[PDB]
Design a protein around this ligand. Structure first.
Ligand SMILES: COc1cccc(CC(=O)Nc2nc(-c3ccnc(N)c3)cs2)c1
Ligand SMILES: COc1cccc(CC(=O)Nc2nc(-c3ccnc(N)c3)cs2)c1
Lengths: 386, 387
């Protein structure tokens, strides 16, 4: 390369939203260093003291100029999870409405889990699919991570399933939309691993979008992934993920969702968590349908096609072999124009902040005696849209 | 407003004078990684995971950004306290520069800020120009335009300086010191070693180590002495509240040495010279030299007096008006456009004939976080520069 080339390459890298060394990732680096060094113990070191003093006025200006939590008015707590809460907010200046997921920095470190969010960020930020919930801004402070997404007013599939005996027409529509959306994620080289109705959200038109990309992972050259982590609720997970694989695992979960929609309960439910794991491992004999003519021949066929060992699982050869399945044969929609058709349940909403589909809903780090670098696992999480 | 805050934050990342422009920010990451890559500290998972995460990236960054291996070293054209100056050729552009190196370890065992600043933004034909300023874990680098004509020490050592020449060189020093003063700085250490010659034989000031910013009264309050033992003014020597009058004392010393051949307060020992300075009232004497003109003597004595009566106390113009400078060859306003008394005859773009023939220890591995690279974050001048 030439002199100019090297300069222009470096210059563009400061401007790239996919760059690790963007103007924003670099500002995080400084902001972190200053948080982890402002203690009296460490200030005994002159290098540390002089540095902090030198960058006092500057670090403050930035802390006040950059996007902060006090820039938003909180409207309602629309959810709760492991390491935080999701809330309906209004950006005080623009007056624009968003869903904001908060993640506790102290808790994440304590609970040793402090790297999942990376996958969740990139997916929502750059997916640019009508099937993925859109990330507009990502920011932070010494205590939390913030994800500013577009608000899904229709609620989740858990709420839908709880308010209707789902007819087969609807189950076909919702399964198909899940299939198209999982395929979009796979096409970005990702495996979800724990697909559940809690992750399936409804837009203002009643169409599907996937959310909460916690368990997601990037595939290797062979389209494969390795792990050994703590399973949450085993109910929706593939046997091979519990036994610990490729994207076949996400198709196992689709069969569990299609079962639950039509039967009313999950196929491997048991009292205890360990109970559910046993039923999954012994799927070959545990999977049974009730004696009511209700489920069609093809619905049963597709369920069993997905609820088998990976080696014979519908999907092992690709999306198209799932799409071709007779269960989907219909006179209402084409796969290529489905998200343009009329959704089976269209939400009737009172406002831009209607929260009718959502059910009605502080330990910090100690002072360190030496350098601990608690802010280091979060440098570069920041993101802004233009 | 929302936009206002973006714009404000945006002008800050772009400003070459900003503390948080792309240049400083990249230095901040580069530093953190250097001060953390040790086995002791890597036992901390936060530290290990961070380093592993930013491995591939920090390397790309290091390979792209300006580094010392981008230059071919032609000769060591100097040495000083904290490093060496060398004639280099940028391997890609093939362009020739003088590069001053400063040992990061030795410095620890903050003058460079004033020096960097003056050379980068002076925008005067009297000041040596800074093009790039880069670093690493061991050195600071200052890429300046190469002065092929050498210093005034070399000139004075190869010629019996005639008065015509001494007038020219003094005048150019006067114009250049005034330029620094106009940037609100006291030079504090004016000497022939700091006076360099361009390809045309014209003056430029270099090595701005001792440079300090004047206050509202155009004064400096230093509790300790600063400068060279022979050029140091009585008031800096006993520091301390003083002004730019001190630089004019040194011009006197520089005038006397060019005409007499020796410094005015020279003595056997260094302590001896200090004594003679403090007694400038009786020590200043001229030899039986049927060549030092009446005015040359007058100007020397005008500068070599106590500050209260020193030529310059009222301003540059009273120095300029002095009869010593009365001549029919140049005007003050068109002097650097006149033909220099010694025009260097140079063989190439890398002719180093005016430079005498010339011919490493680092920080130990730390057991805990020391942050030895923190006093240098922001010294880089490459990404965000004034054009
Ligand atoms: C992993 O730790 C946590 C912490 C807190 C909450 C949760 C659940 C969770 O992930 N909810 C999500 N909600 C949205 C969301 C997007 C658009 N609109 C609406 N209404 C909700 C995206 S992810 C998990
Ligand atoms: C601070 O301690 C040190 C360390 C290393 C060298 C020195 C002497 C010193 O300051 N030399 C200079 N040389 C130049 C220079 C510019 C253009 N062209 C040419 N040929 C030389 C500028 S400053 C002092």
């Amino acid at each position: 390369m030439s002199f100019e080339t090297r300069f222009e390459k470096m210059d563009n890298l400061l401007r790239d939203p996919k760059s690790e060394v963007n103007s924003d990732c670099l500002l995080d680096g400084l902001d972190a260093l200053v948080y982890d060094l402002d203690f009296p113990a460490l200030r005994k070191n002159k290098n540390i003291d002089n540095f902090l003093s030198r960058y006092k006025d500057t670090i403050n200006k930035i802390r006040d100029l950059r996007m902060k939590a006090e820039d938003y008015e909180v409207v309602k707590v629309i959810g709760r999870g492991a390491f935080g809460e999701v809330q309906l907010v209004r950006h005080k200046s623009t007056r624009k409405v968003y869903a904001m997921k908060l993640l506790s920095k102290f808790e994440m470190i304590k609970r040793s889990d402090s790297a999942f969010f990376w996958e969740e960020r990139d997916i929502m930020a750059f997916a640019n699919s009508p099937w993925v919930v859109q990330l507009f801004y990502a920011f932070q402070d010494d205590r939390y991570l913030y994800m500013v997404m577009e608000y899904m007013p229709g609620g989740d599939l858990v709420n839908l399933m709880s308010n209707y005996d789902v007819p087969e027409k609807w189950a076909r529509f919702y399964t198909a939309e899940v299939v198209l959306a999982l395929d979009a994620i796979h096409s970005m080289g990702f495996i979800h691993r724990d697909v559940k109705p809690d992750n399936m959200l409804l837009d203002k038109s009643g169409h599907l979008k996937l959310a909460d990309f916690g368990t997601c992972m990037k595939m290797n050259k062979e389209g494969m992934v390795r792990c050994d982590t703590a399973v949450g609720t085993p109910d929706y997970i593939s046997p091979e993920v519990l036994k610990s694989y490729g994207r076949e695992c996400d198709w196992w979960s689709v069969g569990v969702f299609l079962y639950e929609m039509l039967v009313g309960d999950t196929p491997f439910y048991a009292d205890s968590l360990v109970g559910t794991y046993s039923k999954i491992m012994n799927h070959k004999n545990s999977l049974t349908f009730p004696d009511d003519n209700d489920i069609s021949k093809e619905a049963k066929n597709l369920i069993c096609a997905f609820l088998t060992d990976r080696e014979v699982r519908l999907g092992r050869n690709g999306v198209e072999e799932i799409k071709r399945h007779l269960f989907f044969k219909n006179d209402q929609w084409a796969w290529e124009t489905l998200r343009d058709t009329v959704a089976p349940v269209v939400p009737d909403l009172s406002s831009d902040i209607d929260t009718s589909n959502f059910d009605d809903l502080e330990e910090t780090f100690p002072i360190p005696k030496a350098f601990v670098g608690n802010q280091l696992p979060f440098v570069g999480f920041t993101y802004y849209s233009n």
